[PDB]
Design a protein around this nucleic acid. Structure first.
Length: 1073
RNA sequence: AAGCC
């Protein structure tokens, strides 16, 4: 409950010249007491009188009522920041070295010197793009420094390391003053022109870095990155994190985890000798020297010290540095520069063509319905993103403009213009609009924003391709329900003294122009083979249309802004934006590795233990008939690099016998590692989410980094949350939501009261609040209702429905209309109306929590019912599993050591149910987990009608509605829905093996009947309760269940009426991946 | 005013 205490200290620290705590209670008499107390406090404040007597008087309210919020009456003028900063601003400011960056605009020049006029200005290259100010971040850092001013021992050292660093940020900022933000949290030209262009983004990156500093090493790293970053805005992250690829190869393997036949992690005490050719050492040295020529000193020395022995025990430092470099900020170049960088492919094209054929052979020969109704599938799938141009659109009686894809398809259909048979050109006549993608350390990449003709023509086919991958192991990213742990396991499996791993980063090749000819031609050749496999008109046309998109793309043109102009240039490289981006890219990368390996063997004889393509990297494990030597590694490597070289591909190809390093993960010393480089106080791009959504995201970001190895002080994260979640009533009246409002599992949840532990209402007041918040979950939108009433809209919904089903509509029809009414949320005007409605409802709710007819059941109510029937008892579980993911915090790591981990994702969509499969065989429709859940619980007769209404034949519908499988599905769908409501696949839980035998002993559940749903919930609730206790206490407990039989029948009814909750916290997990 | 997932 320390969040509430922390908030007051911060408010008291920020404002000095009152605070009015607002309480509430589920009990009527107590609530009046809360009402009386609130009234007295306002009256006393409106008279400059002490509130000390009132607190004593309403001691009961403070003691038993629940704090709902805090009122902030501050009569200053959002200043203080300027005044506060000077005490810390004593060190000498920093001076930008305007000679470190190639492109002139990447150097820290004075804003004016880059944009002499207010019309030439743009924040596009330094916009933090986040809904929180620089001034607030500064305020947060100072507040923390004051609190830990009188600290001692080691805590003091942490403060001292931080105070030093913040001084650099302060001193430099003061020389120009603090950049003031506008309503939309942007930094305009007038504020900007006096100060160094990159001032604000740099301060945000530095503050974020320094507040994540604890050990002396963190301090050394933060200081170097902070100083270097101010001048270097283009190669510092790449230079800092580049030695990692060499390093993984060095460390020896002394016992690691592998994958067994059951596709699960299993410990293997084996030893693998890290074999490294002298050449590799020179390459590593060149990297270290390069870091050195760039001003770096402390960071290069640390790698050098580590290099004497190369102990996986002192490796955490190397990992720490790699995670750290990403926090310098994003590299945001100019669209044109990002764009500008851009006979023996016979084997490579053939493999791509053959791979394309396998993924569709069976679907095509049979005459799969999804291929036949491909157009329909694309329409249902259609998002609400950009189509490219901002068209003028008339709805009902309203003339408005939008770039949205959904809006464009509807308007075009209502005007006979909708024509997916004609795949628009993307050449010089119709240049492709461009989108961008920014990432720290690496260079900016462009994105094709193609017209919806392309998405529809590609959506059915890509989906078939994905399914083929789903059961193909070479495709790491798509195989089964597999998580990264299984991939880590596979590489280790075959590592021995007579095998060498081959990892290669092919990100550069995908964007190469050399690549585009063999790529499109390979898919097209494959498409032709597929066409000669059937005669189906629907299959050929859908298949043909896909062929057309590849041909149009072969020669595309792009609209690259060059100031305030839009130069049209000829783009001959494969950018991404298509539906087939990831699947096609996966096919090409895999095709490429196979091509290289095939060429190399003519020389050396090895065995292909495993081959893989995972995103922008691909790798293989080879086995030789003899023992591997340093000389052998150099020879295999030179030949592989040379093979890549002949194909004119710029790629990083390395060879080791112990580790690998790819964009997603890296395996050093038999242990798995994941870069913790998610930026906190700077975003890639601006979206349409709110401050609350953003606060939840920052917390989520904090949780992922913390798990991965980078920890930002929680008090700082909490401070950020208080600023972001606040709401202004007026100009001097600010309202700050309480801990209870913020953490309770509601539609307004932003973070968990305790990291890695999700709590659910177990008290009446919590329940009262939870019910009240839901009462105002969805708000109305006038603009949205209008269009929901417009002809063009209803016809679009009607047109889709009359094409999908045969018999009758409504459970399906009601759903299609909403799904569409939702896609209007991308349209700002509608989104804006919703936020305004939410704030007013929220302001009133915090003020005096309303009523509610409840009558709605959720996950929390079901849990609350169970709790009282469990008897806890101290138990003990020994640690039996060695650590494979070294960076995990100590409490999370302990759960894994005792119960183990998993290598899969728990089915939380219900796609593995027979009914979902049946719908798939005959319908292009895709019911959600929630829809399936409502449908399975319907009366036998209703289910039969719904299946038929979707095109399912009678013999099949009739057979299922009675069968054993239908009864079984019922349980499976509920299990899937329940797992989904409990976030068993996210955060910390996704790691734990919930079916651990060790975990199972701790649960003692005697059967007093035999009714699946009830047995499953009790066991799950017990596993979660035991694990949460373990996470917080480091010790275990045994749970006994004495749940009545009369009770279970009541509970089972309760279960088939659970409502799903939507919230920033919920959105944040979805947002992560 | 920012495509696949």
């Amino acid at each position: 409950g320390k969040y509430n205490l922390i908030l007051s200290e911060y408010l008291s620290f920020i404002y000095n010249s009152v605070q009015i705590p607002i309480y509430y209670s589920s009990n009527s008499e107590l609530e009046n007491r809360c009402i009386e107390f609130h009234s007295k406090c306002l009256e006393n404040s409106k008279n400059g009188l002490s509130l000390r007597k009132l607190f004593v008087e309403y001691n009961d309210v403070i003691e038993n009522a629940t704090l709902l919020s805090i009122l902030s009456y501050s009569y200053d003028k959002y200043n203080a920041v300027e005044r506060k900063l000077v005490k810390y601003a004593k060190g000498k400011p920093l001076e930008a070295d305007l000679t470190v960056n190639e492109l002139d605009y990447e150097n820290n020049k004075m804003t004016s010197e880059l944009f002499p006029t207010a019309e030439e200005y743009t924040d596009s290259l330094m916009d933090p793009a986040i809904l929180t100010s620089l001034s607030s971040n500064l305020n947060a850092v100072m507040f923390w420094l004051e609190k830990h001013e009188n600290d001692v021992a080691e805590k003091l050292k942490v403060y001292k390391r931080r105070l030093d660093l913040f001084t650099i940020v302060a001193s430099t900022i003061n020389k120009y003053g603090v950049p003031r933000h506008n309503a939309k949290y942007r930094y305009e030209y007038d504020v900007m022109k006096d100060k160094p262009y990159y001032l604000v983004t740099w301060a945000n990156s530095s503050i974020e870095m320094l507040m994540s500093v604890f050990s002396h090493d963190d301090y050394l790293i933060a200081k170097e990155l902070i100083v270097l970053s101010y001048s270097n805005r283009s190669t510092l992250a790449k230079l800092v994190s580049s030695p990692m690829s060499i390093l993984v190869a060095l460390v020896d393997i002394n016992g690691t985890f592998i994958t067994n036949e059951e596709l699960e992690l299993e410990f293997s005490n084996k030893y693998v000798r890290a074999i490294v050719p002298d050449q590799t050492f020179d390459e590593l040295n060149q990297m270290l020297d390069n870091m050195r020529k760039a001003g770096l000193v402390d960071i290069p020395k640390m790698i050098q010290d580590w290099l004497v022995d190369r102990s996986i025990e002192k490796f955490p430092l190397m990992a720490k540095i790699y995670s750290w470099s990403f926090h310098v900020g994003f590299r945001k170049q100019k669209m044109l520069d990002a764009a500008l960088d851009q006979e023996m492919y016979r084997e490579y094209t053939m493999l791509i063509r053959d791979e394309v054929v396998k993924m569709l052979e069976e679907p095509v020969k049979h005459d799969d319905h999804l291929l036949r109704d491909s157009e329909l599938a694309g329409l249902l799938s259609m998002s609400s993103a950009s189509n490219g141009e901002s068209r003028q659109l008339k709805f009902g009686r309203k003339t408005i403009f939008s770039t949205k894809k959904n809006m464009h398809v509807m308007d075009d259909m209502a005007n006979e213009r909708y024509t997916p048979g004609i795949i628009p050109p993307v050449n010089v006549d119709k240049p492709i609009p461009l989108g961008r993608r920014d990432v720290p350390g690496r260079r900016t990449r462009i994105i094709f924003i193609l017209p919806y003709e392309y998405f529809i023509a590609q959506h059915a086919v890509v989906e078939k391709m994905l399914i083929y991958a789903k059961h193909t192991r070479e495709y790491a990213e798509f195989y089964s329900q597999s998580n990264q742990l299984l991939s880590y396991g596979d590489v280790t499996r075959f590592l021995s003294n007579n095998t060498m791993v081959l990892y290669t980063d092919v990100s550069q090749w995908d964007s190469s122009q050399h690549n585009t000819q063999p790529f499109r031609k390979g898919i097209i050749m494959g498409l032709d083979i597929l066409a000669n496999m059937t005669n189906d008109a629907k299959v050929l046309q859908t298949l043909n249309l896909y062929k057309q998109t590849q041909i149009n793309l072969m020669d595309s043109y792009v609209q690259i802004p060059d100031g305030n102009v839009i130069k049209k240039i000829q783009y001959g490289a494969v950018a991404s934006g298509e539906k087939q981006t990831k699947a096609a890219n996966s096919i090409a990368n895999l095709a490429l590795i196979k091509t290289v390996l095939s060429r190399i063997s003519n020389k050396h004889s090895f065995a292909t233990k495993i081959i893989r393509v995972d995103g922008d990297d691909n790798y293989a494990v080879l086995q030789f008939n003899t023992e591997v030597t340093k000389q052998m590694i150099q020879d295999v490597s030179n030949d592989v690099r040379e093979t890549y070289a002949r194909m004119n591909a710029k790629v990083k190809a390395l060879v080791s016998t112990v580790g690998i390093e790819i964009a997603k993960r890296y395996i050093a010393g038999g242990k798995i590692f994941f870069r913790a480089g998610i930026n906190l106080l700077n975003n890639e791009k601006r979206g349409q989410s709110t401050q609350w959504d953003q606060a939840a995201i920052l917390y989520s970001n904090y949780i992922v980094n913390r798990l991965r190895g980078f920890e930002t002080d929680r008090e700082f994260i909490l401070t950020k949350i208080m600023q972001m979640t606040s709401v202004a009533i007026t100009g001097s009246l600010r309202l700050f939501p309480s801990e209870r409002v913020l953490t309770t599992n509601s539609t307004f949840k932003v973070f968990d009261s305790e990291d890695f532990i999700i709590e659910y209402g177990t008290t009446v007041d919590e329940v009262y609040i939870q019910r009240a918040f839901m009462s105002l979950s969805s708000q109305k939108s006038g603009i949205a209702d209008e269009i929901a009433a417009s002809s063009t809209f209803k016809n679009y919904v009607t047109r889709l429905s009359e094409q999908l089903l045969f018999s009758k509509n409504n459970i399906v029809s009601r759903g299609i209309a909403l799904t569409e009414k939702a896609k209007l949320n991308s349209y700002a005007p509608i989104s804006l109306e919703k936020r305004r409605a939410q704030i007013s409802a929220l302001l009133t709710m915090l003020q005096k929590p309303v009523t509610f007819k409840s009558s709605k059941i959720t996950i929390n109510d079901i849990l609350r019912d169970i709790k009282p029937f469990f008897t806890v008892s101290d138990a003990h579980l020994p640690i039996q599993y060695q650590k494979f993911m070294p960076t995990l915090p100590d409490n999370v790591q302990y759960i894994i050591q005792c119960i183990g981990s998993r290598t899969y994702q728990i089915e939380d969509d219900g796609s593995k149910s027979a009914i979902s499969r049946l719908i798939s065989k005959y319908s292009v429709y895709k019911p959600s987990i929630e829809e399936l859940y409502k449908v399975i619980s319907l009366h036998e007769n209703e289910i039969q009608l719904y299946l038929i209404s979707l095109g399912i034949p009678k013999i099949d519908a009739d057979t299922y509605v009675g069968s054993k499988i239908y009864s079984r599905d019922k349980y499976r769908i509920l299990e899937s829905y329940v797992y989904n409501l409990l976030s068993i696949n996210y955060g910390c839980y996704q790691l734990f093996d919930f079916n651990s035998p060790d975990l199972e002993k701790l649960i003692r559940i005697p059967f007093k009947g035999k009714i699946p749903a009830v047995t499953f919930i009790l066991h799950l609730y017990a596993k979660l309760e035991v694990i949460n206790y373990a996470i917080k206490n480091g010790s275990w407990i045994s749970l006994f269940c004495n749940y009545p039989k009369s009770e279970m029948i009541k509970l089972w009814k309760k279960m088939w009426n659970i409502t799903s909750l939507r919230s920033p916290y919920t959105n944040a997990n979805f947002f992560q991946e």
